[PDB]
Amino acid sequence: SSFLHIGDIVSLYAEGSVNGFISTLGLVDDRCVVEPAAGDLDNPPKKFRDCLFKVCPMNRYSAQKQYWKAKQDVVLLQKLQHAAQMEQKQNDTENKKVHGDVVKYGSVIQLLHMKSNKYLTVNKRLPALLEKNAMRVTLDATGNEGSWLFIQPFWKLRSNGDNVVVGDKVILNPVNAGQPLHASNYELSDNAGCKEVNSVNCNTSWKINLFMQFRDHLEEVLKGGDVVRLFHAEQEKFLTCDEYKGKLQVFLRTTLRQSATSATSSNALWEVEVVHHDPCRGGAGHWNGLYRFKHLATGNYLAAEENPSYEKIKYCLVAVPHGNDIASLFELDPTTLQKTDSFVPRNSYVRLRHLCTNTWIQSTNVPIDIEEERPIRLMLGTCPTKEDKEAFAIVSVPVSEIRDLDFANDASSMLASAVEKLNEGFISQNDRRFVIQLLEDLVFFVSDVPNNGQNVLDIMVTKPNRERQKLMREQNILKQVFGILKAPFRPLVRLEELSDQKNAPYQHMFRLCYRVLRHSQEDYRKNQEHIAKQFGMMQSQIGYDILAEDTITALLHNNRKLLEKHITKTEVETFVSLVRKNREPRFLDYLSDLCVSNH
């Protein structure tokens, strides 16, 4: 065992009335829940990234609070702003100075969620969502005085002034609230099987496990739980796993780009897990060790399985959902000489070897989609012999891309759920409101503009974002939006009935979806072609108050090719007919815009 040094990454169990790691929902949600069904201490949850907290020292927010009140004479405001900046810099300097110190019972600590980078603050002036008598507990990025927490001994063995030890049980009492954190039994309506964490008198014990030490958090090391991409040096391609014909397949994508390293895709993101005796312990990885690889997009584990073709290769790589089997353990061997057995340096070439079958990974020049024009996927398999030329560089990914991927994955999940619910034919008011909130949030995310309360169906963007657009397309979110637009007219709602108040919300929903299909097609050709592939559906619903005409005009505004293809006698006839019906100048303006493109 060891002390809880400041900076260590830990996992807070919730032994008490309800037992389970204190996770937090994705997206902009600032609610923390303990889910007992996911797993226990022996069996950790599948998504072991929302239960990691970093312990940090005291952080003063006096001047920051005053600046916030000033925001919610000019020389005074400027002085207050300068005060906040100097106070912040003093804060980081103190944090760096104190880093590495031990934490003692009765001390002051702040829990920062590594995934969301938000402090676990407690608000005393608001009641909890489900437990009114209990005060609010939420995540705040900047932090406030509520983030302060005393760590106190739940056991009589430890007293004030003693040093905390990993694996023990403690009580977290906020400085201002003065009420220990409690894992209530009030299930959240939005998500099944998730309870609520609120600050109120209770007797729960928060067992502080350990996941990573302060010394192993160096950014110059391949750390457990880190996310990297496996670039192939010889073939200059990125390893990827994707849904192809109903079954997920792992392959090496080919790109026509001049610079192969620039072919960055969110489907090629892999997370490295160090296999230790303690299931809830990671830490820095060593050359002499066993590693596991997980896929963020789908939560699958890379492994090897018998190849029916046994071609020259005996086993082939494939994605497997479960990860407790022995077929997913891989050893990393170096390509150069290294001093003793030290930490694996970042951005270093390595070779993957399977423990079970004692075989070495290898690339192959046999496309899997032979029945498809322009093959892009290359099969990968393991050969018993060792090839020195075959090495897999481990390239790190910026934290931002991970943040957008995490944002988009959950949103795609709930969009798919909404699509299935609509296909079934039944939906509730609360579900419709939640989906509307998701749609507007997606619009803001794609636009990237800060939210200032503007109209959801009216927003201005100067510089369209490319990486977010690619993430939007390749995560199937656009496909889910198309499903939302298509499934209702199959009948739950009718196009002519949209005018009626009964179906008024649906119409608004559809508008949002159409807007979601407008920002993506800006300066990016691939998104425009992908959206235009279903031009028939947009043409069929054009005319009604769904903004389909605006989306079509934007799609064909700049791309000449789609301008000639998707403009013929039929669609112009429909435009003339709806002009005759509506007799409105806007349709005439749309026709005029369609007349000429790019000046």
């Binding site: 003063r60 006096s62 005053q66 608001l126 009114k132 005060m135």
Partner: protein, 739 residues
């Protein structure tokens, strides 16, 4: 009953009967009623009410069942002579919450709602004297009164116990009793509209409009009843007081700007306005009620004009007209006795003071009383009476509090300078002295005599162990008086006592924790609180102890030789930082916090700090400059930032504060040959601002007429500090040179 009659309306009898409270501290409804009468309409006893009494009564309610007498007692205890007690409210709410659902019952369920309706219809004609309905009503009223205080947790708990859905379901029901309506309306007014919660669901809900239309229906019922001589006093008082109060509270808050959006809400507002108009038109409305009605109508009118609601033209012109209109021998013997009493009291004022003076003098020279050559005379010559008095004062600390206080006080007066009381007083003192008995040097001699006697041990034992605030204050005053004048022997004896004493950490522990409570109270607050008033004696005592540059005492105060070490200098710096607002104050907001009340305490704190630094003491200097709280910046902000609020009407205080701050900084850099101090002070001190304030002090000197401290020496001291600082700042050196 006779006891209740005897202790009603007279605080003296109430306190006298309360003295023998052990008789009524027993189960029984009659005892509860009697004690309620004892603690009725008085604030002194209610404020000082002991927690065990409330705890015992709550346990009695939990155990023996639910009764209204105890709830009535709690309600009376909460409010005294029109002012609530924060402490009693807090303990009552905590005890109720901890008691459980048994003590506190809320009929918020469907079946419970049916039970409430059954009880109500059982008492349709009127509420019985004792019934569960009365218990619920009393509990609701008590909870509303408790929530009246500014406590967020209590308001949240009250909202959780009674959701808005319950009150709308019950109040808006087809049949409702007046008592429940009044209690729930008061609960909403004192728990929903006025709250510190940010959500404030009431202001963004349509439920309050349902309450408003129900109130309008109630007023219509009242008017119809009087039209038919069916007047009901309960309905009339309810509509007059609580309906108007809640309506005004809701429509007067600034958070209802966007609440009025539906045209139905506008129609409800019009109905309310014409309802008030009908109320004022009839002559039945009373003058005191007329004022409240007019005020509510005014507030509604401002709301209407602000919303620009287009009311009907005829009644709109009407409301305008009302707005303009409102804008517009037995007795003789008693009095003679009182006159003689006051005349005698005025005449005899100096004689009593002379008698206390002769008491002090006799205590000072007990030997003269006995006969020369007697054994008792020999005992008194070498200590004797004074030694026994001091020794037994500690013994009787718990036996008699008043005797100990009086002994300490007379000892304090012994060390004070003599004074003249008057010709008659002097003559009386001379007669008493002759009958009974036959500069700084004298004060120092008396202090040394007490030092030899054992006064230091008595005072130390009093501070280390005393649960009475008065005794502690008197003990601190005695220490100050003994240390007054910077005696070099009393300080030595005190230091020997702390160094060689088993208690050791106890005395510094009580001092340290008192200082901690002081900073906590100061932080919470932002007259003066009782906790902060006691801080001036402690700071003066420390400054006097470390006066005359006693290096050993300063080192001991900074850090003791015991196993557990407590520092007082850093707590002093932290306390000054908290009082001055910390960073926000130093940025330029310091002037707002500082006022005339706390100026003296700040001056005393600065004097103590500079005394700590002087000597010079290196360890204290490093501790203050390198403090974790970064308090030193405020010391700079005192000289850089002029106190805009105080400077307008009080200048001498501002210049005194600036002078003390400059002296403290100079003491901090008295013999500092390193650079850490220079850099730390320079970070807060902008050289340009420093030279600018130097020039400002020169040009401000003109106001010497009304200030005893001339701005010139404060400016000169700042310039001397600037010279000492320039050794490590090239820019400051360049600016400091003349043109």
């Amino acid at each position: 009953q006779f006891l209740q009659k005897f202790c009603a309306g007279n605080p003296g009898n109430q306190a006298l009967l309360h003295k023998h409270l052990h008789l009524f501290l027993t189960p029984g409804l009659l005892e509860a009623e009697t004690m309620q009468h004892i603690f009725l309409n008085n604030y002194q006893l209610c404020s000082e009410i002991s927690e065990p009494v409330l705890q015992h009564f709550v346990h009695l309610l939990a155990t023996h069942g639910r009764h209204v007498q105890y709830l009535d007692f709690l309600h009376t205890v909460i409010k005294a002579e029109g002012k609530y007690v924060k402490k009693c409210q807090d303990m009552i709410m905590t005890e109720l919450t901890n008691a459980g659902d048994d003590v506190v019952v809320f009929y918020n369920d469907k079946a419970s709602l049916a039970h409430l309706l059954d009880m109500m219809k059982a008492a349709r004609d009127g509420v019985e004297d004792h019934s569960p309905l009365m218990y619920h009503i009393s509990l609701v009223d008590l909870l509303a009164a408790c929530a009246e205080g500014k406590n967020v947790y209590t308001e949240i708990k009250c909202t959780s116990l009674l959701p808005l859905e319950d009150v709308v379901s019950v109040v808006t029901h087809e049949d409702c009793i007046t008592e429940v309506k009044m209690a729930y309306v008061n609960f909403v007014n004192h728990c929903y509209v006025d709250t510190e919660v940010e959500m404030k669901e009431i202001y963004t809900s349509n439920h309050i409009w349902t309450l408003f239309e129900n109130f309008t229906l109630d007023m219509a019922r009242v008017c119809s009843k009087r039209e038919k001589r069916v007047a009901d006093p309960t309905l009339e008082k309810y509509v007059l007081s609580v309906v108007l109060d809640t309506i005004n509270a809701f429509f007067s808050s600034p958070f209802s700007e966007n609440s009025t959006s539906l045209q139905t809400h506008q129609t409800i507002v019009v109905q309310l306005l014409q309802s008030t108009t009908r109320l004022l038109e009839c002559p039945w409305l009373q003058q005191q009620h007329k004022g409240s009605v007019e005020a509510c109508i005014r507030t509604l009118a401002m709301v209407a004009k602000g919303r620009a609601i287009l009311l009907p033209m005829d009644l709109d012109a009407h409301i305008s007209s009302m707005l303009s209109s409102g804008a517009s021998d037995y007795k003789n013997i008693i009095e003679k006795l009182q006159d003689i009493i006051t005349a005698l009291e005025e005449r005899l004022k100096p004689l009593v003071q002379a008698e206390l003076s002769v008491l002090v003098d006799v205590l000072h020279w007990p030997e003269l009383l006995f006969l020369e050559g007697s054994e008792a005379y020999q005992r008194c010559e070498s200590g004797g009476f004074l030694s026994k008095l001091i020794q037994h004062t500690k013994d009787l600390m718990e036996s008699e509090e008043k005797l100990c206080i009086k002994v300490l006080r007379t000892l304090q007066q012994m060390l004070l300078k003599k004074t003249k009381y008057g010709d008659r007083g002097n003559q009386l003192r001379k007669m008493l002295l002759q009958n009974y008995l036959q500069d700084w040097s004298a004060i120092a001699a008396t202090q040394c005599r007490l030092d030899k006697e054992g006064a230091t041990k008595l005072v130390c034992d009093l501070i280390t162990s005393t649960k009475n605030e008065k005794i502690f204050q008197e003990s601190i005053g005695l220490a100050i008086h003994l240390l007054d004048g910077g005696n070099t022997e009393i300080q030595k004896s005190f230091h020997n006592l702390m160094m060689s004493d088993k208690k050791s950490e106890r005395f510094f522990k009580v001092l340290h924790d008192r200082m901690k409570r002081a900073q906590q109270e100061t932080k919470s607050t932002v007259e003066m609180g009782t906790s902060v008033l006691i801080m001036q004696p402690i700071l003066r005592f420390l400054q006097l102890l470390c006066e005359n540059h006693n290096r050993d005492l300063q080192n001991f105060l900074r850090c003791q030789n015991n196993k557990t070490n407590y520092n007082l200098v850093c707590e002093t710096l932290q306390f000054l930082d908290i009082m001055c607002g910390s960073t926000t104050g130093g940025l330029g907001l310091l002037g707002l916090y500082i006022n005339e009340d706390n100026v003296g305490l700040v001056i005393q704190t600065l004097e103590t700090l500079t005394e700590y630094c002087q000597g010079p003491c290196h360890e204290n200097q490093t501790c203050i400059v390198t403090h974790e709280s970064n308090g030193i910046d405020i010391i700079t902000a005192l000289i850089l930032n002029d106190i805009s609020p105080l400077c307008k009407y009080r200048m001498d205080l501002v210049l005194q504060l600036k002078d003390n701050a400059s002296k403290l900084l100079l003491a901090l850099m008295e013999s500092r040959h390193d650079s850490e101090n220079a850099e730390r002070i320079l970070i807060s001190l902008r050289p340009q601002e420093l030279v600018d304030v130097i020039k400002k002090a020169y040009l401000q000197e003109e106001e010497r007429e009304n200030s005893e401290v001339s701005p010139r020496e404060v400016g000169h001291n700042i310039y001397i500090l600037a010279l000492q600082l320039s050794r490590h700042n090239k820019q400051l050196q360049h600016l400091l040179k003349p043109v």
